[PDB]
Design a protein around this motif. Sequence first.
Motif, PDB file in Angstrom:
ATOM      1  N   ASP B 273       0.831  -1.196   0.000  1.00  0.00           N
ATOM      2  CA  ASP B 273       0.000   0.000   0.000  1.00  0.00           C
ATOM      3  C   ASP B 273       0.865   1.245   0.000  1.00  0.00           C
ATOM      4  N   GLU B 274       0.388   2.293  -0.661  1.00  0.00           N
ATOM      5  CA  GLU B 274       1.073   3.585  -0.694  1.00  0.00           C
ATOM      6  C   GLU B 274       1.856   3.959   0.579  1.00  0.00           C
ATOM      7  N   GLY B 276       3.626   2.184   2.466  1.00  0.00           N
ATOM      8  CA  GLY B 276       4.774   1.332   2.699  1.00  0.00           C
ATOM      9  C   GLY B 276       4.402   0.144   3.563  1.00  0.00           C
ATOM     10  N   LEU B 277       3.152   0.126   4.018  1.00  0.00           N
ATOM     11  CA  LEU B 277       2.626  -0.984   4.801  1.00  0.00           C
ATOM     12  C   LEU B 277       1.860  -1.964   3.921  1.00  0.00           C
ATOM     13  N   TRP B 278       1.536  -3.130   4.477  1.00  0.00           N
ATOM     14  CA  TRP B 278       0.769  -4.143   3.754  1.00  0.00           C
ATOM     15  C   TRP B 278      -0.544  -4.438   4.446  1.00  0.00           C
ATOM     16  N   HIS B 279      -1.565  -4.778   3.655  1.00  0.00           N
ATOM     17  CA  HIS B 279      -2.883  -5.134   4.184  1.00  0.00           C
ATOM     18  C   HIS B 279      -2.898  -6.503   4.892  1.00  0.00           C
ATOM     19  N   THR B 280      -3.663  -6.593   5.979  1.00  0.00           N
ATOM     20  CA  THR B 280      -3.670  -7.782   6.828  1.00  0.00           C
ATOM     21  C   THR B 280      -4.183  -8.998   6.061  1.00  0.00           C
ATOM     22  N   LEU B 281      -5.087  -8.757   5.118  1.00  0.00           N
ATOM     23  CA  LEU B 281      -5.288  -9.704   4.030  1.00  0.00           C
ATOM     24  C   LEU B 281      -4.627  -9.061   2.836  1.00  0.00           C
ATOM     25  N   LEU B 282      -3.511  -9.648   2.407  1.00  0.00           N
ATOM     26  CA  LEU B 282      -2.596  -9.006   1.474  1.00  0.00           C
ATOM     27  C   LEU B 282      -3.241  -8.633   0.155  1.00  0.00           C
ATOM     28  N   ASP B 283      -4.215  -9.428  -0.281  1.00  0.00           N
ATOM     29  CA  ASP B 283      -4.893  -9.201  -1.559  1.00  0.00           C
ATOM     30  C   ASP B 283      -6.265  -8.526  -1.369  1.00  0.00           C
ATOM     31  N   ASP B 284      -6.469  -7.929  -0.196  1.00  0.00           N
ATOM     32  CA  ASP B 284      -7.701  -7.207   0.117  1.00  0.00           C
ATOM     33  C   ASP B 284      -7.373  -5.766   0.540  1.00  0.00           C
ATOM     34  N   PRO B 285      -7.339  -4.846  -0.430  1.00  0.00           N
ATOM     35  CA  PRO B 285      -6.940  -3.453  -0.225  1.00  0.00           C
ATOM     36  C   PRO B 285      -7.828  -2.766   0.797  1.00  0.00           C
ATOM     37  N   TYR B 288      -7.549  -3.686   7.055  1.00  0.00           N
ATOM     38  CA  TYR B 288      -6.676  -2.731   7.705  1.00  0.00           C
ATOM     39  C   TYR B 288      -5.219  -3.084   7.398  1.00  0.00           C
ATOM     40  N   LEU B 289      -4.364  -2.073   7.389  1.00  0.00           N
ATOM     41  CA  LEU B 289      -2.937  -2.291   7.273  1.00  0.00           C
ATOM     42  C   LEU B 289      -2.442  -2.930   8.571  1.00  0.00           C
ATOM     43  N   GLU B 290      -1.393  -3.743   8.495  1.00  0.00           N
ATOM     44  CA  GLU B 290      -0.887  -4.380   9.696  1.00  0.00           C
ATOM     45  C   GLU B 290       0.632  -4.232   9.791  1.00  0.00           C
ATOM     46  N   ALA B 291       1.051  -3.548  10.846  1.00  0.00           N
ATOM     47  CA  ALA B 291       2.437  -3.153  11.051  1.00  0.00           C
ATOM     48  C   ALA B 291       3.438  -4.290  11.334  1.00  0.00           C
ATOM     49  N   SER B 292       3.018  -5.323  12.049  1.00  0.00           N
ATOM     50  CA  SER B 292       3.983  -6.331  12.460  1.00  0.00           C
ATOM     51  C   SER B 292       4.365  -7.216  11.276  1.00  0.00           C
ATOM     52  N   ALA B 293       3.369  -7.611  10.490  1.00  0.00           N
ATOM     53  CA  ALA B 293       3.624  -8.316   9.233  1.00  0.00           C
ATOM     54  C   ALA B 293       4.530  -7.451   8.369  1.00  0.00           C
ATOM     55  N   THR B 294       4.134  -6.187   8.201  1.00  0.00           N
ATOM     56  CA  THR B 294       4.934  -5.209   7.462  1.00  0.00           C
ATOM     57  C   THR B 294       6.399  -5.207   7.937  1.00  0.00           C
TER      58      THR B 294
END
Lengths: 109, 378, 378, 378
Positions: B273-274, B276-285, B288-294
Motif C-alpha cells: 500500500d502507498e 509502505g505498509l501491507w494489508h492484513t489480508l494481502l490481496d484485500d486493499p 486494515y494495514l498491519e504493522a507487524s507483518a509489514t
Amino acid sequence: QMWDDTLMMTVLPLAKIGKLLNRPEYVEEATYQFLLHVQNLMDKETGLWFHGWSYDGHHNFANARWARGNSWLTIVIPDFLELLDLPENNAVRRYLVQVLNAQIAALAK
Amino acid sequence: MVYPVKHSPLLRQPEHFIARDELKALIQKVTHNLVNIKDETGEFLLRLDDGRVIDTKGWAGWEWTHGVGLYGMYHYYQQTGDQTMRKIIDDWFADRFAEGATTKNVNTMAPFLTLAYRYEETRNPAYLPWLETWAEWAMNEMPRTDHGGMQHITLAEENHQQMWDDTLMMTVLPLAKIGKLLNRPEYVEEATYQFLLHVQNLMDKETGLWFHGWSYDGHHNFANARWARGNSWLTIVIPDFLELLDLPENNAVRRYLVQVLNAQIAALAKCQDESGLWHTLLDDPHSYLEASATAGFAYGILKAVRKRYVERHYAQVAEKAIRGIVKHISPEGELLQTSFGTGMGHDLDFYRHIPLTSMPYGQAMAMLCLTEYLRNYF
Amino acid sequence: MVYPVKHSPLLRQPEHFIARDELKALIQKVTHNLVNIKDETGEFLLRLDDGRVIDTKGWAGWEWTHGVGLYGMYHYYQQTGDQTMRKIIDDWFADRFAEGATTKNVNTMAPFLTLAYRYEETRNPAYLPWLETWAEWAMNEMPRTDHGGMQHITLAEENHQQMWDDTLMMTVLPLAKIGKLLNRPEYVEEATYQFLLHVQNLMDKETGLWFHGWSYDGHHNFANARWARGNSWLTIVIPDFLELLDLPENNAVRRYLVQVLNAQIAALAKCQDESGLWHTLLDDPHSYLEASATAGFAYGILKAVRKRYVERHYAQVAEKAIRGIVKHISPEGELLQTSFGTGMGHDLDFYRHIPLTSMPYGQAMAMLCLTEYLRNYF
Amino acid sequence: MVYPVKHSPLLRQPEHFIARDELKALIQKVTHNLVNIKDETGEFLLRLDDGRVIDTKGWAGWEWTHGVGLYGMYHYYQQTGDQTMRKIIDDWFADRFAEGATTKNVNTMAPFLTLAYRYEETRNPAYLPWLETWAEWAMNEMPRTDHGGMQHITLAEENHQQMWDDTLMMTVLPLAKIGKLLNRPEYVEEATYQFLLHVQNLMDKETGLWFHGWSYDGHHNFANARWARGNSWLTIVIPDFLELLDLPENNAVRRYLVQVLNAQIAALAKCQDESGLWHTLLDDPHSYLEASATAGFAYGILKAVRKRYVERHYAQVAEKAIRGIVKHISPEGELLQTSFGTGMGHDLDFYRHIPLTSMPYGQAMAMLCLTEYLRNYF
C-alpha cells in the motif's frame, strides 16, 4: 509452459549424463527441475499431478489428472532416486519419496 | 580547490532519511515498551480448563510471542554487543527457568532459537539439557500429520492434521539452529524436509504468496487466506534458514528456496500500500494495514537484498516499508497497527476483524527490521 | 473463552508425583547424607595383612564405592552446574591426591571416570598424569585372564582368572571415557573388546539377565547368581558406553549392545516387584528387596528410553522404580535397603545374607537415577 | 578379619625407598640450589676477544646448560602445575630478553625448547618472533658440514665439519618442537634427517654406545670416546623425539629410532657400576664416576620404559641409578660428581682429566630424572 513429460524426456537424461560425465552441475539443475515441477504440477488435494502449467496466466489448463502424463512421474521418480543414490535421511530423497507415496497412494485408490 | 561530488551516485553521501543514532534510540524506546507491556483488562489472557492462565502479551509470560521478542532483541545484541539487550534476554530465561518448564508445543519452542545462540556464545552447561530435550521432542514426540508434516499443535488446541505458516518460525528454524549448533545433521535434515513439505501445502503458485493453513483432514487450505503476518514468517525464515544452511550457490535446495522467496517478494512488491505498509489480508486493499507483518516483510526483503537472494531494485520496497514502520512507532515506543494473536480462520472475515494491540512480536519485529536497516549505516 | 485441554494427552500437563524442586531437595539431602557416612563399630572396614585399613563406607576413603559416588555427583553437577556439587567432587580428589596414591586394581580405578570429566572441562594439567598413568596400567599391567579378559583384581583379592559384572563399571567405562578424551582409540577398542568378552562369559542367554561372575579356572559361573546390583552395573554402563561411542544406528556393535540391553530390560520388567524395587536375587521373590540395584536399574531404563535404545513403554517400569526409590529415602537422606559390599558367592544364600548398611554407592545411585529423572522436568 | 596381600606382587604396596613428598622437597631443594649458582672467583668466565664476558655457571647467564635447566623445571611444572617453577622459567626469559639476545649457536638454542612450551600454553605474542627467528636460523643459516650435517658451532669455536652428540639435545629437539607447534613440517623433516645422519656418524655398532664426535675433515671420530654425558643426551633425546613425532608403531623411522635406543640402553645396563652410576668413559672402569650423565641415563631409561620403547625389566637399571643420584645430592641440594663443560677430546686420557663443578645441567639433569621418577607415584 511446464509439462509432466519433461521430467522423463529431458530431465532424467540430463541427470544420467551428469553422473556419467561427472558433471554435478547437470545433476543440480535436474534436481531443481524436479522441485519446480512438483511445485507447479502436483495436486496436493489428490496426490495426482496436473498435466500442465503455465506462467502465462499462472494456471493448470484444464487441471487434467491425465494418466499417461501421471505415469511419467511414476516411472521417473524411482529411476531418478536410483541415480541420485542418496542416504535415506536426506531431505531431498525423503521429499521425492513423499511425492511418490502420495501419487501411488492415490493410484491404488 | 573543491571537488564535485553531489552529482555522482558513486561519490556522494547516502540519503538517510533518519540518522543512525536516531535509529538506535528508537530501538531502545521500542525495547523499553516491550518489557513494559501489560494486559490491564486481562482480556487477552490465554485460559485453559487446566486452570492455566498464560499471559501472551506481558513480558513475564512464556509463548511464541516471547520467542519472537527474544530473537529481535538477540539480533540487535548480536550486531552491537549492547549489554542492556543481553541482560534482558538472560533474565527472561533465568526467570522462566526458575519458575519451571512450560508444556511443549509448536509455540513454546520459539524461545529456544535465542537460547541456542546464547549457548553458542557462553557454553553455559545449564542450557544444554534444555536444548537437547526440546529439540529431541521436536524430532521424536511432537505430533506429525500425514507425510510426517509437523502438526501445528498449540498450548490451546491439538489442531489435528493441520500445518501452518507459523510453524516455520516457531519450531523449524529453532530446530535447524540447534542442529547446526550441536552438530546433529539429522535435525537440519528434518528441518529442510519440513520446509519442502510446508511449501508443497501452503504456497499459492497462483500468486507467489502463501496460504495461512493446510489440513490433511479434507485436504484444504481453510479460508484460503493470504494472511500478512503468516507470510511475513516466511520472508523472515527463508533468509535466516538459508544463512544457516550456507549451501553453495548452485545447490538445488538453495536455489529452490531462493525461488520461493523471490516469488513471494515479487508478489509483495505489487501488494504494498502507498503507506509502505501491507494489508492484513494481502490481496484485500480494504483490510486494515498491519504493522507487524509489514515489519517482518521489511526485514526479509532487506536481508534478501543484502544477501543477493533477490536483485537490488527491491530495496525501494524495503525502504518504503521502513519509513512506514518508523511512522507507526508511537512516542511511547509502541508499534501502532499490531494485530493480536491470530488463529486459523474458516472464513476471510475472521482475519478482517482481529483486534489491534501491542505485542512482544510487534515490538520485536520492529527491531528485527530496524536492525537489518542499521546495516545500511556501516 | 477457556480451552479444553485436560482431556488430551498431547495438551495436558505432566502428572509428576513429585515437584522439580522437591526432587532437588531430596538430592541435596541424599548428598548431605553421603558425605557424612561413618562406620562407628569399624565392623565394615577393609583390613589387609600389610596393615592397611581402608574405609569403604566413609567419604574419606578410596574404593570403587567412592568412584560411583563421584559419578552420581558429577551427573547432577553436569546437568545443573551446581557449584556445591562441583566443590565436593574436587575436594575428594584434592584430599586423596595429597594423601598420595592408593594401589591400582579394578576398583580403585573407578574415580578416574569422573576425573576425566573434570579434566575435560578444566584442562588442569595436574590431572593428566593421573589419567595417563592409570589408563596405561589398565591397558598394559592390570592382570588378564585367558583370552585377554580383564581380571577382577581388587585391593583384597587376586581373583585369578575371574571376570565379574562389576568390572564394566569400575574399570571399563573409565578406560573408554579416557580413551575418547585423550584421543587414544586403542583404549576404546580394548574397552569394546572387554564388553564383548564379558557378554560372552556372563550374560545368561536363557533369561537375558547376567550371572555375577565367571572363572576360566574351571570354566564356570560360580553359583550362577543373577544378582541385582551386579546386573544393574550393566544397565548403567551400556547406555553410558553407547552414548560415548556415538556409533551409527546400524553399526553391528551398536546393535549388538542394544540387543544386550533390551534382553536385560525385557527381563527386569518381568521380575520387578509390586513395590517398584527388585529382589537382590532377581529371580528369587523370597530374597530381600534391594534399593541400590533398583536405583541403578531406574537410571539405565530411563536413559535407555530417552536415547531410544529401548521402546517408550519401558518408561512405566522406570516410573514404578523411581517412586519405590523415593519411598525408600529416609528423612535423613539415607537410601534404606542398601546391601553391603558383595563379593563372589559360591551359593545363593551368600547373596540372600548380605548385611544392610548405607554406602556411597547406595546414595550415589539414588542421585544417579534421580538426576536422570529430573530430565523429565525440562 | 584380614586379607593376606603382602606375599603377592599383584596385591602389595609399592616399596618406595623415598616418599613422594620427600622426593618433591628434594627437587625443590636442588632447584633452589640451581637458581643460586655463582663463581665469585670468576673461575669459569668464558672470555672472548670480542670483549664478551660470558657467565656459564651463574643462573643469570645464557648457555646450553640453562636450556637443560629450563627443560627440567618445565617437566616438573608440566607434571605438577607448580607455580613456583613456572615463575622461575618465565622470569629467566623476561630477564634475558630485557638484557638482549645473545649470538646464535648450537648451545644458545637449547632454552627455546622450553620457550616453545610456554608459548604453547600462553600464546604470548611477544614469544613468536623469538621462536620464528631462531628456528629460521637453525634451518637456513647455521653452518652445515658435508651432507648437510648440522655443524656443532659453539660460542667460541666453529668446530668446522664437526658433528657432536650434544647437537641433538641443544638444537635438534628444539627445532622439532617448534616445527610441530608452529605447524612447520619442514622443521620436523630437517630434524629427522639430522637424527639419521648423527646416528650414521656417531653411533658405535660394535657396542651400542655413541662416540662423542665426528668430523668430515679427515672422516673420523676423534678419540673414539664413548663419553657418558655425551651418551646421556641420546638417552634423553630419543624418547622425547619419539614422543613429539607420535608415529605409528610399525613406522620404519620410529622402529629405527627405537632400535638405536634399545642398542644403547642394552649396553648401558651392561656397563652400569654397582653404585648405579656410570663411568665418564663408559667402557673404562678406571674412569671416574659422573653423576650428571647418570641422571641423563636415569631419565631416558625411566621414560623409555614408561613409553614402552624398551621392556619393563630395564626399570631395574633405572631404579639403581635413581638411588645413586639421590645418594649424590648434598643437603645443600647440589649434585656431586658433576663434570665441567667437556669439549671434543683428541685422546681418551682427555676425558679422564675433566674439572668437576656444579652446573645448571648437573642440578638440571638431577631434577629431570627425579621429576620423571615421580611418575612412579601415581
